[PDB]
Amino acid sequence: NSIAIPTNFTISVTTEILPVSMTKTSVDCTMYICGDSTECSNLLLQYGSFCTQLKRALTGIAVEQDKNTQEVFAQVKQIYKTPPIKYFGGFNFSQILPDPSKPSKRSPIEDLLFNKVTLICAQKFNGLTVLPPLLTDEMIAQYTSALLAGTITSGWTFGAGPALQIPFPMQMAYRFNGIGVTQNVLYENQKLIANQFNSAIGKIQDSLFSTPSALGKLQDVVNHNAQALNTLVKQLSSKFGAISSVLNDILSRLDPPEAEVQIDRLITGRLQSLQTYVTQQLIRAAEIRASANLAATKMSECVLGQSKRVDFCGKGYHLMSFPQSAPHGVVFLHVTYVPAQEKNFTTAPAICHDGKAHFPREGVFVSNGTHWFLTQRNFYEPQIITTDNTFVSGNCDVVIGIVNNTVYDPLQLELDSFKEELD
Amino acid sequence: VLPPLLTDEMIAQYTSALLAGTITSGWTFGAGPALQIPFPMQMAYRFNGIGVTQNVLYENQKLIANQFNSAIGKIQDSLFSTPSALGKLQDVVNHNAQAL
Amino acid sequence: QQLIRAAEIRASANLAATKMSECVLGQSKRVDFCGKGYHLMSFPQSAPHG
Amino acid sequence: NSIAIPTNFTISVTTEILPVSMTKTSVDCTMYICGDSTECSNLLLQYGSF
Amino acid sequence: YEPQIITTDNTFVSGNCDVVIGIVNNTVYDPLQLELDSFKEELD
Amino acid sequence: NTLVKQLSSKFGAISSVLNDILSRLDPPEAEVQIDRLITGRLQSLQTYVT
Amino acid sequence: VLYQGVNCTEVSVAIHADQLTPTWRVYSTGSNVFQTRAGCLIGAEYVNNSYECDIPIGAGICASYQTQTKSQSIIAYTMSLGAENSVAYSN
Ligand SMILES: *[C@@H]1O[C@H](CO)[C@@H](O[C@@H]2O[C@H](CO)[C@@H](O[C@@H]3O[C@H](CO)[C@@H](O)[C@H](O)[C@@H]3O)[C@H](O)[C@H]2NC(C)=O)[C@H](O)[C@H]1NC(C)=O
Ligand SMILES: *[C@@H]1O[C@H](CO)[C@@H](O[C@@H]2O[C@H](CO)[C@@H](O[C@@H]3O[C@H](CO)[C@@H](O)[C@H](O)[C@@H]3O)[C@H](O)[C@H]2NC(C)=O)[C@H](O)[C@H]1NC(C)=O
Ligand SMILES: *[C@@H]1O[C@H](CO)[C@@H](O[C@@H]2O[C@H](CO)[C@@H](O[C@@H]3O[C@H](CO)[C@@H](O)[C@H](O)[C@@H]3O)[C@H](O)[C@H]2NC(C)=O)[C@H](O)[C@H]1NC(C)=O
Ligand SMILES: *[C@@H]1O[C@H](CO)[C@@H](O[C@@H]2O[C@H](CO)[C@@H](O)[C@H](O)[C@H]2NC(C)=O)[C@H](O)[C@H]1NC(C)=O
Ligand SMILES: *[C@@H]1O[C@H](CO)[C@@H](O[C@@H]2O[C@H](CO)[C@@H](O)[C@H](O)[C@H]2NC(C)=O)[C@H](O)[C@H]1NC(C)=O
Ligand SMILES: *[C@@H]1O[C@H](CO)[C@@H](O[C@@H]2O[C@H](CO)[C@@H](O)[C@H](O)[C@H]2NC(C)=O)[C@H](O)[C@H]1NC(C)=O
Ligand SMILES: *[C@@H]1O[C@H](CO)[C@@H](O)[C@H](O)[C@H]1NC(C)=O
Ligand SMILES: *[C@@H]1O[C@H](CO)[C@@H](O)[C@H](O)[C@H]1NC(C)=O
Ligand SMILES: *[C@@H]1O[C@H](CO)[C@@H](O)[C@H](O)[C@H]1NC(C)=O
């Protein structure tokens, strides 16, 4: 017969950092294998379509990377703007909304994310090039801003039809109903909730600034791609058992037949290095695609809605989420309701009044040791047990652990204070 | 072959912690602090969650507890008598051994 | 082959973790996600490699 | 105008089995290719960072 | 949109009028008092 | 379509047809030319399966 | 034709010097040579008007085939992301 019920709460904001896309590379098979060598290219032509297959695989990956970014961020029909006056019930969004004074309209948090993660083809060039993304960082920032403006000014309505404006405190009140907490909890505590939110956002900035490992997930993608290209360039140095790693020295020192044999050995080594690179890129691309699909799912369900999936949109009961862009990825700020300061109460399945068994409609029966009250489950708020708060089914002889307590009826209580005169 | 970081005993301990939390506090522990609740009331809320009123559970609490206990016994009989039941995990082992 | 099968295992582990959070640490409204029927609750058990 | 409504219920328990992890192997590249052979190893170094 | 009269059956009461920011003044209709005042309305 | 097309490649061999290699050359040179074709076709199958 | 990863000056010099490996040449007027981050785009007229992306080029720039002041040609533009909609938010 013992239940614990929260008497307070904390608004918590957490970060979830997900890769969305990876560097889009392109490789000139012939130039990589046969660096300005006619004899090598002519030998390379005898191996078949391998260069074509490698080109197609990398093209498919590059297209996939643009698809992944578009599916994660281009989820809004219109580019939404916040009102000129950034007053949202006392909730301070200045650290998530774009700062209009900068050359790139990014939020302070976005500036941090872009600064922590790190036409001259300076890096690893041997016929190996890097293609730009279809959407620029400014365009991604515009999609993120549109999503924030939509969520802040219209809640989830912009994600399932036209955007419908709602006062922000009423949006939060509905989110509270979504997690099983009545509207009066938020309205009575609106200043506390806004202050906890603003504090949590400041903590997000300090967490990302002071903990370099938080963004490791995105940095690792960059580092892995850099290693792949670095390795691929290093593979040109290897001899693979040939007389020399330099193709021009093979042609310069040896006669055509033996030179062709040594060249064929270099062709095998370089071609296998390209096949290894492409295979690793396809596996990594599949991993990135899965991450992008998860990020798009969390964009739709966490940002353009309210989710009842446990731990999907952060730890605690989900209230709302806000996207932020990052290099090659997305960071979600998940705002959740966390119960706090629980108290021990005695409980009972039902109240026995006149022999009828009374069950709560929306709540749990609790006792402070002297009186029975009905409370909401996620926030202690004692109420008088009445016939409106409860429903009746069966009698006191069926329910195990039923307790004897008075259920008050207003109508027969007021009849008692109204018709007593009998005249 | 390198050993796992978490031993079979440590995995069992995490599983035990998860079972103790769910049984004694329902979903309150997943969302934050673990708040004790009588088990039949946790079930009453789960029934309400699926659109069945609380009185159905309380009126039929003995029947429900008996059906649960019988279902668990059936789980043991099913796993014991059907060697293929765990094939998904055995296949992983076989796939790695075959590769080596 | 190990990288491809590791990716398969990772996807399975991600599904198992999702089910752990939504089926064991909560009550799910997703049809057939946490078994057939209307979901009431779930209990994990350890198994070799899973 | 016809609707069917349950008058009773069954509590059912089902199993879901998921892989979580796979065997963590480790391979000594040099011993596998050129085991206990210096002469072979000196050629293995010429194939790059395999 | 489907407007209905605001009554004591449609709303719930918690707290006074000073704590909520942006509260407005409007009549909330109670069906039971109007009848019950009617039940002893003529006092005969 | 690509895998069948790979059968026409030489991969450094004199010809893509095993019967021409066997008919024109002596056994050990023919064996070298056949290994060149086997390596190419086997690599093509490994690519297809991957 | 998009020459990826290079400056339009380097490409223009390579055509005048006959240094490029492709043997075909794209007629240039100087009004149809536009420098993008993806590379040098020769044979398309860049316009200020933003449109929905059709044929992607890269780094925000897309191209399409449209009638220009009554005469059709390939144009390049910075893609539009969507219509702008300011929500009438108030207390
Ligand atoms: C929303 O929160 C941000 C902080 O996260 C507020 O920005 C801060 O605003 C103050 C001015 O009110 C800025 O100046 C400060 O002034 C004091 C004066 O004593 C000085 O001691 C400080 O060193 C600082 O100069 C402050 O720099 C600024 N901080 C940031 C990060 O922008 C913002 O005003 C809040 N908005 C609302 C509507 O509450
Ligand atoms: C529920 O928990 C919140 C905290 O999460 C409680 O609000 C906090 O109450 C304490 C004490 O009343 C405040 O500390 C005081 O702050 C003033 C600021 O000027 C300072 O001068 C005092 O010396 C003291 O440090 C704290 O700031 C306040 N936090 C917030 C965000 O408002 C709340 O009272 C709790 N409610 C219940 C019913 O337990
Ligand atoms: C709803 O279904 C449950 C079964 O899932 C019904 O309970 C079952 O009722 C039958 C007949 O009353 C019980 O069988 C009898 O069991 C006694 C045990 O001593 C035996 O001596 C009899 O010969 C007979 O086999 C059965 O055990 C019982 N099952 C459980 C788990 O209690 C229940 O009555 C159904 N309710 C309605 C309203 O249909
Ligand atoms: C349980 O709650 C009731 C209701 O608040 C407490 O009784 C009230 O106590 C206040 C003083 O704090 C009195 O002014 C009220 O008149 C009391 N009301 C009634 C109906 O008795 C009761 O004391 C609480 N019990 C415990 C153990 O805390
Ligand atoms: C709740 O009240 C009922 C009476 O309305 C109690 O039932 C009585 O319990 C006494 C115990 O000595 C018996 O002698 C009576 O015969 C019972 N009467 C009936 C009609 O059941 C019931 O025990 C009370 N429960 C609690 C927990 O106090
Ligand atoms: C709702 O009505 C109450 C009166 O029933 C208003 O309260 C009065 O407000 C005036 C404002 O000048 C004060 O001078 C009175 O002393 C207040 N009286 C009481 C009893 O509070 C209240 O302001 C009204 N609210 C709105 C939003 O119109
Ligand atoms: C092209 O070169 C000129 C100088 O010749 C330079 O000013 C310009 O910025 C370069 N453009 C790009 C895109 O690199
Ligand atoms: C409830 O009572 C138990 C008694 O052992 C105690 O350990 C626990 O901390 C109490 N919880 C609260 C919230 O008071
Ligand atoms: C909303 O309330 C704030 C309170 O500070 C006020 O400054 C702002 O102008 C109000 N907005 C409207 C549209 O009334």
- Nearest-CA residue for ligand 7 atom 11 is G7
The two three-digit tokens of residue A58, written as one number: 């990398």
Q: Which of A275, A128, A245, A267 is nearest to D48 (CA)?
A: A245
- Asked if A322 contacts A92 with a C-beta cutoff of 8 angstroms, the reply is no
Which residues are CB-neighbours of A123 under 8 A, at least 6 positions away?
A130, A226, A229
- DSSP class of B3: P
Q: How far apart are CA A219 and CA A46, in angstroms?
A: 40
Quickly tell me which residue has 């996600």 as its tokens.
C33
Which residues are CB-neighbours of B20 under 8 A, at least 6 positions away?
none
Contacts 24+ apart (CB under 8 A), B27-31: B27/A310, B27/C25, B27/C26, B27/C27, B28/A4, B28/A339, B29/C25, B30/A310, B30/A311, B30/C21, B30/C24, B30/C25, B30/C26, B31/A310, B31/A315, B31/A316, B31/A317, B31/A338, B31/A339, B31/C25, B31/C26
The two three-digit tokens of residue A155, written as one number: 């809640």
Q: A3, A5, A344: which to mutate for ligand 8, most atoms within 8 A of CB? A: A344
AA letter at A42: N
Q: How far apart are CA E29 and CA A26, in angstroms?
A: 72
Cα A43 off chain centre by: 50
Sheet holding G39-42, edge to edge: G2-4, G39-42, G33-35
Judge if the beta carbon of residue A368 lies within 6 A of ligand 4.
yes
The two three-digit tokens of residue A99, written as one number: 């700062």
Query: How many CB atoms neighbour CB E26 within 10 A?
Result: 7
Q: How far apart are CA G74 and CA G46, in angstroms?
A: 9
Chain A residues in contact with D46 by the CB 8 A cut-off are 238-241
The two three-digit tokens of residue A252, written as one number: 């310069």
Residue A39, chain F, CB below 8 Å: the answer is no
String of DSSP letters for A124-188: S-SSEEEEPPSS-HHHHHHHHHHHHHHHHHHTTGGGSSS-----HHHHHHHHHHHTT--HHHHHH
Residue E14 burial (C-beta neighbours within 10 Å; 0-12, 13-18, 19+): middle
- Asked if A337 contacts A181 with a C-beta cutoff of 8 angstroms, the reply is yes
The two three-digit tokens of residue E36, written as one number: 């019950």
Q: Which helix (H) or strand (E) holds A232?
A: helix A216-234
Q: Which helix (H) or strand (E) holds G57?
A: strand G55-58
Distance set, CA E18 to CA A187, A318, A382 (Å): 11, 29, 20
Residue C46, chain D, CB below 8 Å: the answer is no
Q: How far apart are CA A172 and CA A193, in angstroms?
A: 10
Q: Which of G76, G68, G71 is nearest to G33 (CA)?
A: G76
3-state secondary structure of A347: strand
Quickly tell me which residue has 């925000």 as its tokens.
G60
G24 backbone φψ class: left, alpha, beta (φ>0; ψ -120 to 50): beta
The two three-digit tokens of residue B19, written as one number: 């079972």
Q: Which of A163, A362, A377 is nearest to A171 (CA)?
A: A163
| Signed CA dihedral, A388, A392, A395, A401: sign only | negative
3-state secondary structure of A375: strand
Chains E and C touch (3+ CB pairs under 8 A): no
Quickly tell me which residue has 């016939």 as its tokens.
A387
Distance set, CA A257 to CA A239, A305, B89, F15, F39 (Å): 18, 70, 55, 16, 20
Q: Which of A355, A353, A310, A358 is nearest to A334 (CA)?
A: A310
Query: How many CB atoms neighbour CB A422 within 10 A?
Result: 4
3-state secondary structure of B98: helix
Q: Which of A371, A376, A348 is nearest to B58 (CA)?
A: A348
Instruction: Give φ, ψ of A167 to 5 degrees.
Output: -55, 140
Chain B residues in contact with A400 by the CB 8 A cut-off are 40, 58, 61
Q: Which of A4, A69, A91 is nearest to A319 (CA)?
A: A91
| Resolution in units of Å | 2.9
Return the exposure string of B56-90: e unless at least 16 CB atoms fall within 10 Å of the residue's CB, then b: ebbbbbeebeebbeeeeeeeeeeeeeeeeeeebbe
Residue E1 burial (C-beta neighbours within 10 Å; 0-12, 13-18, 19+): exposed
- Asked if C7 contacts A287 with a C-beta cutoff of 8 angstroms, the reply is yes
Beta pairing partners, A373: A366
Instruction: Give φ, ψ of A356 to 5 degrees.
Output: -85, 145
Q: How far apart are CA A138 and CA A325, in angstroms?
A: 10
Return the exposure string of A348-387: e unless at least 16 CB atoms fall within 10 Å of the residue's CB, then b: bbbbbbeeebbbbeebbbbbeeeebbbbbbbbbbbeebee
String of DSSP letters for A2-34: EEEEEEEEEEEEEEEEEE----EEEE-HHHHHS
Experimental method: cryo-EM
- Asked if D38 contacts B99 with a C-beta cutoff of 8 angstroms, the reply is no
Q: Whose atoms come closest to the Cα of D9: which ligand?
A: 3
String of DSSP letters for F2-46: HHHHGGG--TTSS-S-HHHHHHHS-HHHHHHHHHHHHHHHHHHHH
- Nearest-CA residue for ligand 2 atom 30 is A192
Which value, to the nearest 10 degrees, does the dihedral of the CA atoms of residues A149, A154, A160, A161 take? -100
Which residues are CB-neighbours of B9 under 8 A, at least 6 positions away?
none
